[PDB]
């Protein structure tokens, strides 16, 4: 609602003192989503109490479901971490296996050719790298 | 005292208001407070989970990319085999592979050294 | 007849202050119940969001598996065919084996640093 709020949170309602009723408006904790509503008698007081229990009953029920979906998540998470560990391992394996094939191909398809310049430039770049880690 | 049995119209009511007042006095908030705690607890579990989810989502994109780069590299090998001896001198891709390979090596131990120091500083 | 009225009128001077106590605490408890539903609702939607992200990861992870399965199926015939196969041919073999070894080393180093960090973030 927009204006209509203002059009019915004034004046007071069901015999409420205009002064106490005005005190509820300012003591309102969330006027964005709430209005002062008079509750008269121990009956409305119990009615509200029982509503709380019904909703808390519903509240707790969601949390149990949600709790359920966390355990699933947590376990889903652990599986996911596991598959990551494998697939990195496989990749490391396959990667090295490809480098072995390319190497065998290079030696073969260059059979009986002079050692060649750019090939000797690797040697150096490779020898310096082996030394840099020893 | 003729129709003054309206004292009975002020007896039954007082109790009604008294026996509810006792009903209010019986109710507590303990359950409503579990709900309050449980929410803060599940937020905490969800948060650690979602944190780790982002950690290894990064791990997964890095992995997907690399698997794809390595799939390209195997296709180089297949291209080499297909190529006949008369067109091998035009097969420049294997050369690019190795040239790329050694600068990847140089870039790798530089990372690994960097990772080592970080891991030393993380221990002090 | 009349002195009784002094009882019930002293009970109401014992039940009024109860009412105000109760109404005060009702307005307090129902504030809690409102905070709850709000926080429950927020929790729930993040819970669904994270479910989604999880399933996205599951899909990417299936994709990766398929990619790697593709890569092996492509790689084994090459390995076999290349299996059914000199100063330059011997020197060149040293050069490219040196690369095979370096790659083997750097991958071990990588694998070891990862396992250390695995023992770390425990």
């Amino acid at each position, epitope marked *: 609602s927009p204006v209509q709020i203002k059009q019915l949170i004034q004046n007071p309602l069901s015999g409420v003192d205009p002064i106490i009723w005005e005190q509820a408006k300012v003591d309102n904790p969330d006027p964005e989503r709430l209005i002062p509503v008079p509750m008269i008698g121990f009956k409305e007081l119990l009615r509200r109490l029982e509503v709380q229990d019904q909703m808390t009953k519903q509240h707790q029920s969601r949390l149990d479901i949600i709790s359920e979906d966390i355990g699933e998540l947590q376990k889903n998470q652990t599986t996911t971490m596991a598959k990551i560990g494998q697939y990195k391992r496989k990749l490391m394996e396959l990667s090295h296996r490809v480098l072995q094939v390319l190497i065998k191909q290079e030696i073969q398809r260059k059979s009986g050719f002079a050692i060649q310049a750019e090939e000797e430039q690797l040697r150096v770049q490779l020898d310096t790298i082996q030394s840099e880690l020893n | 005292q003729l129709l003054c049995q309206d004292v009975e119209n002020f007896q039954k009511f007082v109790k009604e208001q008294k026996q509810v007042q006792e009903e209010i006095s019986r109710m507590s908030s303990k359950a409503m407070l579990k709900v309050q705690e449980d929410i803060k607890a599940l937020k905490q579990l969800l948060s650690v989970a979602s944190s780790g989810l982002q950690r290894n989502a990064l791990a997964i994109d890095k992995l997907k990319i690399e698997t794809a780069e390595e799939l390209k590299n195997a296709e180089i090998a297949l291209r080499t085999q*297909k*190529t006949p001896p*008369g067109l091998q001198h035009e097969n420049t891709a294997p050369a690019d592979y190795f040239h790329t390979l050694v600068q990847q090596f140089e870039v790798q131990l530089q990372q690994y050294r960097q990772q080592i120091e970080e891991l030393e500083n993380h221990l002090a | 007849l009349e002195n009784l009225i002094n009882k019930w009128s002293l009970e109401l001077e014992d039940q009024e202050k109860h009412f105000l106590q109760q109404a005060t605490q009702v307005n307090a408890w129902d504030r809690t119940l409102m905070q709850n539903g709000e926080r429950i609702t927020t929790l729930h939607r993040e819970m669904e969001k994270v479910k989604l992200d999880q399933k996205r990861l599951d899909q990417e992870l299936d994709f990766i598996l398929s990619q790697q399965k593709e890569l092996e199926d492509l790689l084994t015939p090459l390995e*076999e065919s290349v299996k059914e196969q000199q100063h330059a041919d011997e020197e060149r073999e040293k050069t490219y084996k040196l690369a095979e070894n370096i790659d083997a080393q750097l991958k071990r180093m990588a694998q070891d640093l990862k396992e250390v960090i695995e023992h770390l973030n425990t």
Partner: nanobody
Amino acid sequence: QVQLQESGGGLVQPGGSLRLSCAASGFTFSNYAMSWVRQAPGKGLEVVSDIGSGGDRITYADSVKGRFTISRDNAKNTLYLQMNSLKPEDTAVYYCANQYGRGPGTQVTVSS
């Protein structure tokens, strides 16, 4: 020792069709990738079609895309080439090959 022998070539009119074979021996054909290569007498070598060990990962030169089809029977160590909608410019020697060797060839002329 990669040993290859092709055939099925001949002389045909423009628009004609032909089906070439390449018999493989001396190597475990099913594990190798194969190519069809051609050379006209003045020009240089041109790969026209590729295929992988299992008959997947096929490719074609734009020249012949839509006109040629490559295939193989690993059980009979045989590589095929369907050639349709043939043109004078498709006139060449047709070799079957991979990096390890090639065959003698089979002449394909499309008259003009």
